[PDB]
Symmetry: C4
């Protein structure tokens, strides 16, 4: 077939969110009752199908805590040093239930400075103290309550801790039973020791009251919040990866602009080979062939989308891409054959778009722009025309690339950059929870319409219908002047 490539140049046709509507269907299930949980793997389980993009304007520790608390996942960005990125991961892991099996501790010879340091770093209200670092016999605890009486923090621990026997509990004490012990004895902390009195761990009422406050939290087997981390394909990738895995990261995202590059495929094999059980998310790919190549290399999740991002110019400057809905569907067709979930990354303006990507076969969606004006996002708020804004930049933008996204665009050494992205700003949105509430609300409605009691049914079942540009103008509100909008719509 000498001329086959040449003749098939223009045959393919793609579709995106605005070309298409979901067709309503026979439904015995109400929006209220549907299940929105998704399993990306046995060690990664979300209560909502949402991930925040690793981007320096989108996700850092607080955003990751917030997302995890709602049931989704944050991906900490790589535009910081290895020490810095692993420190962020650790903060997220230790937000709740973090010191139960692996406590920090001090000796009476440390200064109050150290105790202030740990408490502020992890937001944990007390620090257990041991006789020395070898034996680790618990001698007492310095807490936030002890702290308010201390003026100069340069003093040694032994001076501020007045002994009284404090209530401790055996190893493997559990939240539910710690809940009554704290209640019964009227205490906020519960050190865990063995029969020899050696400190094994610590439980706080925060650990307990956070379970009540965020009942939908996405957590590992130990009850700690899930967190992911971005890693590029660079000579230092394994080093970055090593420190992440030691910080108990639940997933890495190997993040590149072209997932089908041999360099990416090799890095995945090399990472899978060193960490057989590590959750590995790899992207971006827009095709079936690319999807199969990442999976065979050992990726256990595949991230889909080339160019669709609100801030990306890849399609404009390089001329390259696939319309996102076709991309998701093309990639989901392949990954389904392997029982592998895909992430739809980029292009989602409204909650409806999310529904469409999930009905096209994605297990989960990853959002940049809808999360950047949110309160937990890294940047602070800027003023334009009296209203508050937050900066949002493409990983392809010159600004982002100077701060270490260069490898993503294969620009890694270059003195003069050629950006695939742009810089912009988004309105301040308030706390993340409210944005998720609307997102999940729109999903529940659509699943209601499509008769899907859970996300699996939705991917396997839901049917779309294509429309014209005139079909799009009908779908939006039209030809009436809008006095007041909604959180779901503009």
């Amino acid at each position: 077939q000498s001329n086959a490539m040449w003749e098939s140049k223009f045959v393919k046709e793609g579709l995106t969110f605005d070309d298409v509507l979901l067709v309503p269907a026979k439904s015995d299930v109400l929006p209220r009752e549907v299940s929105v949980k998704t399993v990306l793997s046995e060690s990664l389980q979300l209560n909502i199908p949402l991930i925040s993009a690793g981007m320096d304007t989108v996700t850092e520790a607080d955003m990751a805590i917030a997302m995890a608390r709602q049931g989704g996942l944050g991906i900490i960005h790589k535009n910081m040093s290895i020490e810095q990125q692993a420190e962020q991961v650790d903060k997220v892991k230790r937000s709740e239930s973090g010191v139960i099996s692996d406590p920090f501790f001090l000796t009476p010879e440390h200064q109050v400075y150290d105790a202030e340091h740990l408490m502020g770093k992890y937001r944990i209200s007390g620090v257990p103290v041991v006789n020395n670092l070898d034996e680790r016999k618990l001698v007492g605890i310095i807490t936030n309550r002890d702290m308010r009486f201390i003026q100069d923090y340069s003093i040694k621990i032994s001076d501020v801790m007045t002994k009284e026997q404090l209530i401790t509990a055996p190893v493997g004490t559990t939240l539910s039973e710690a809940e009554k012990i704290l209640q019964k004895y009227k205490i906020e902390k519960l050190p865990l020791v063995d029969n020899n009195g050696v400190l094994q761990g610590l439980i706080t009422i925060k650990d307990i009251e956070k379970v009540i406050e965020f009942p939908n939290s996405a957590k590992d087997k130990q009850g700690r919040l899930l967190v992911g981390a971005a890693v590029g394909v660079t000579a230092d990738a394994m080093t970055r990866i090593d420190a992440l895995v030691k910080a108990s990261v639940d997933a890495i995202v190997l993040d590149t602009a072209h997932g089908h590059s041999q360099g990416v495929i090799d890095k995945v094999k090399e990472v899978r080979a060193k960490y057989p059980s590590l959750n590995i998310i790899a992207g971006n790919v827009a095709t079936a062939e690319a999807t199969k190549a990442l999976i065979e290399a050992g990726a256990n999740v595949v991230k889909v989308g080339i160019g669709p991002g609100s801030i990306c110019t890849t399609r404009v400057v390089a001329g390259v891409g696939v319309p996102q809905l076709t991309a998701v569907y093309d990639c989901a067709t392949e990954a389904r054959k392997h029982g592998i979930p895909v992430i739809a990354d980029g292009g989602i303006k409204y909650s409806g778009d999310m529904v469409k990507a999930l009905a096209a076969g994605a297990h989960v969606v990853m959002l940049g722009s809808m999360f950047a004006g949110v309160a937990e996002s890294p940047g602070e708020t800027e003023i334009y025309q009296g209203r508050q804004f937050k900066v949002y930049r493409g990983m392809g933008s010159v600004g982002a690339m100077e701060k270490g996204s260069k490898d993503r665009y294969f620009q890694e050494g270059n003195k003069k950059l050629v950006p695939e992205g742009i810089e912009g700003r988004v309105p301040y949105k308030g706390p993340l929870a409210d944005t998720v509430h609307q997102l999940v609300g729109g999903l529940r409605a659509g699943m209601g319409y499509c008769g899907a009691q859970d996300l699996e049914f939705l991917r396997e079942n839901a049917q779309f219908i294509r429309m014209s540009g005139a079909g799009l103008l009908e779908s939006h509100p039209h030809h009436v002047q809008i006095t007041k909008e909604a959180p779901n719509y503009s």
Copy 2:
């Protein structure tokens, strides 16, 4: 066929009003002579193919009176209490010919307050008086003319009514013969009694002069204006329905966002089972399958459209919908097999759109936005830039849902809403009659072009032709500066 659902995801294609034009055809019938009447059922017969949407910004008693007087139908909204909604229905039923068979009456021991109450409630110029409530022997009539001489309304009826024998007439006296009796004896009221003088009814010149004033009125077998009423699927639906049926409502609209929901199907069976002859309009559905399921459940009219409304965000936030012209056609294809009419609800900007929906198979169209700035619509007029406006909100909007449209979106108990609609404003349009005149005028022209002497011919015969976006720009006025517009166009 394991993979069939998966592969058919993107095959369907929809069309809306702007994608399409009607093809002109051999015509011996002029616009002037065509028949625009439609039968939704033997007990529901419209002289124009128009219904006003039950929405709190669109239809209440006056709008329903106005619509009925022009030949269409109002649907009173449910965003009021059951007492309040049935009271509205009653006002519409009693506007004309309402007391002929079931008169109100008083005894001389009532106060003038009561007489003022009835006259103001029904806009009827006089109140018959009977000796007591059991016998009901007519002793006389207090009228608007008697009223102008009364200062304090706290006084008893017996004091103000000076006896003179008044002209009465036998039962079953008819408008045409009442017309000459009032004329012959020079009177405005004509009580109806039996041989024992027991009040049976009342006829007024208003009853007579309204037939002359609105020759196209849509009326039941008794000559009273038709009226419909909205009912949601709620634990209290039957209660609401019971009071409506007792107020002589001609149709209920069971109104939900997803008509294909099992909960809706069951409610229809349950209502059909209790009221075999009640006119039951059920929606909304966008498909053939949904249409068949409502009909088998006992719906005798089906209402079509998901998302197309000027104020709806359903398609944007939930991602769900079908382009309205395809929806109408898909649903009309199914209902035709059963001899069941469909209503096209939502999306109509211009009179031409109306024609297209009817040629696509709808028996009738239901309009929200084109009727909201009209004088008879419930809200009053707001000022923006010196011009008068009227508020118009989607039943999906937060505002509407707080006032009781929540059940429509399956949000019925929810503390935090996720709206499918938005709030806006429309220009004040003057009296309803002028808007209907243009609507019906555009319909008559199109039927002229398509060679259709009536609406049936139009549904069975008319052919469309699809066009591009460039085809749409040609169809509108283009590339000339508009100095003055028209009532039909912008």
Copy 3:
């Protein structure tokens, strides 16, 4: 085939000017050398494929003179009385060579008032005088030169005409030979008489110098400018037609909004039957079937287009129409079978559009909006933002209908109108000739590209290629700021 009509509803697809480009082709012919002439019939022959629409804002006598002088045809509108419309036709016929065979004349007993009247009415510089009305012996001529010495015009002709034998010439003297006689004897007028001296006719240097000034003029066999006239389908149509034919009109346009109406078909048969040789243009039709029905009724030209006009709302308000390029092609396919030419009426914004309509099979195009700001058009110039404007209204607009276009919309008696058109304004364009120069220039270029030495080759040969909306944005100028435009483009 019970369900065939129902299923074929959406199958048809139309195209308009903006959906399509002409494909360039092998060309040995330069723009300069191509022939742009068209034959609508043996008695109607244009040197350019252009007609001005009969509309009260577009064509009256001067516009018709101007158009004819350039090689096209004016259609005088019917929004004036029968006397008035025939008077306009007569002015156009008599502009050049009008008195050669049928001269006006006076007797010495007429007042100078009469002579002033004729000269001003026809713009002819002199009036022949005869002894009396029966014999018609030429006694002399009162001219513009005689006039400048006359103060009071109330005086009798005999008083101002001082006799000198004047040079006359025999009947059937021709322009070329009159040209030398006027030159040889140094005179501006040349009365024509017989051997008995009875006035037969008159020739002026204007008649001669106009042939030189407008070498491309569209003229009848007698050398008089061609003119057309609009006629509606009304009880008075034949009366209007009779006076037109007596004024030597070359064509009538039976003009209706729906050409496929039985009423129009019957009127054409009835007119064809009374005037077998009259040129009859009938429209509007958008289909093949309609085209065949008009032709069999006796129309010898068919006018095509429903809704495409810059000022028409027909498609919006009635929902009715066909995209103009498909309309032209569909109608041209049918008329070609009969050797019948079609006119493309409406929708042409640029000279390129014209080329496309002709390549789609139209013999000629009819322009409203491109001719309304022209100097010869009936309205005068209005001021908006310091620049000069001309009003332009759709025959469907309320304004036009009040002035007698009602029958066109089948509204003929109606107290309350339902308009198919709108009112607007266009910039003042200067003399018509400059607008035609650009129009014809664009046509010559396109015919150059398509390799067409004449219009026939262009209709039979030229191929189009369809494009998207993105194809349209490429075709226009894009993405550069325009400092100065051109007469061909915006």
Copy 4:
């Protein structure tokens, strides 16, 4: 097949840049390593696939020097006299290595005026002097250093040149060896003479240091910069061509609006016949048939595109054209059969567009608008709203045609023009090099995505995917406010 032409009128469908995206593919090659060189012929070899359009607002000598220095090609425009155009070509040829084999020289009897003239004309820092014009024995050199001591330039050379034996070198001395000789003896000039001392040539450090400064330069076998020149089809074409060939032009562009015109085909045969080895670029053509006809006539490169230009109105005014991507593909399909390269001329807004045209089969792209605001372009900078602009006009614009582009539009003698183009302005872009850097950068990224190590692989391999208008809005940045843009994007 009597009716075949008639029925095939609407079947063809075209695509342009915005309808289409490139599909990413398996890639072992990084953007950094890909080869962007193209061979238009053995005597024309570019290091980047870029040509600047011959247009009076785009390319003259400096632009041609700049383009050649970056690896592309300038085409000097024809809107100047033959002397003037050949002088421009000569300046480009002599920028580097121009006097090595064919030196200018003077005799001591010339004035310093002559020496100033040559140095300023060619930007060469010194002028060799010979005893007389026949023998041509080198007696010395007047340089820029000698010049700074001279006040009145009217004096004879012999007076200012103080003799010292100067270092010369044999014929065929090469840059690399001249580089050390200049270094060893500390001199900036190196005259070349034979054994009899007859001046053969000259080498300067500029010749040497330019090779280092512009390592990617596009050069002929002699090491001189490549340059092209525009020629129209006119009675004087050969004369213009003769002087160009004598100035050592590397290519002529026979430039016409319709390449398929017999007049163009004949001119190509006639030019090919007189200059069998001359590089001949001919256009414009949009079709396969036109492409084959130019090639058989002797064109060795074909230039593609009718109407797509940012400033062209051809499609609007003449209605003529083909969407550029289809045009390139249709023409590349034909030329590939002959081993003939095509140029994509017009329509490229962004670097991505460039990639698409090359993947559609073009060997090279030709840019007008992207190069007009560049510093080396002929016009100077205009002020609008405080920012600097550069005028850019279409060769079809009235302005350009008055200055001699008339023949291109077959308007060659015409008193009154009918333009195919428009006049506008573009922002000042700074030095050309920066614009090329971004252009080449975008190309390298796209080739990275498509897995193409060189341009051949890209044409033979790369696959596109079609998208809707909604697909285009996704591809651009969407729905976020842009605070700062990039050089690649807007």
